[PDB]
Nucleic acid binder design. Structure first.
Ligand SMILES: [K+]
Ligand SMILES: [K+]
Ligand SMILES: [K+]
Ligand SMILES: [Mg+2]
Ligand SMILES: [Mg+2]
Length: 136
RNA sequence: ACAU
DNA sequence: CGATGT
């Protein structure tokens, strides 16, 4: 503890896993939605969580903001730190789009810098992350 | 087991 | 109940 209220919170939403994947980013203090990704027909929860963090890094850098990012995904936080999304999702024609976005997000991480702290949202102490979709 |  | 991940 405790919550850094001056932050951006991100989360994935899906219809199936693998299935249709979307994500959004919100102001932790207010819940204002700051970005939302158009649904991607097939992806995994963890690919979506990864894309959401990277989009948040890009969003904050473009705006010269030093705010931290909260994610509830141990996996996606590690993948961003490693600059490598270690997804098991088959690469085929159906999954081409999500894998293109994941590849492009890795490419961005490998060509840009950032100081943004990427913090674990402590769901067991604080309840659901503010960017949650309410689908569970 | 933990995080989704 | 099923799936994605460390
Ligand atoms: K949900
Ligand atoms: K959760
Ligand atoms: K498991
Ligand atoms: Mg989540
Ligand atoms: Mg959620």
């Amino acid at each position: 503890e405790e919550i850094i209220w001056e932050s951006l919170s991100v989360d994935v939403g899906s219809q199936g896993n693998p299935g249709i994947v979307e994500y959004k980013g919100v102001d932790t203090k207010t819940g204002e939605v700051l970005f939302e990704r158009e649904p991607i027909p097939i992806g995994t929860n963890n690919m979506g969580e990864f894309l959401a963090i990277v989009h948040g890094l890009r969003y904050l850098k473009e705006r010269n903001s030093r705010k931290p990012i909260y994610s509830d995904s141990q996996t996606a936080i590690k993948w961003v730190k490693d600059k490598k999304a270690k997804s098991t999702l088959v690469r085929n024609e159906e999954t081409a789009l999500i894998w293109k976005l994941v590849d492009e997000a890795e490419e961005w991480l490998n060509t840009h810098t950032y100081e943004t702290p990427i913090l674990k949202w402590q769901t067991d102490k604080w309840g659901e992350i503010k960017a949650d979709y309410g689908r569970k």
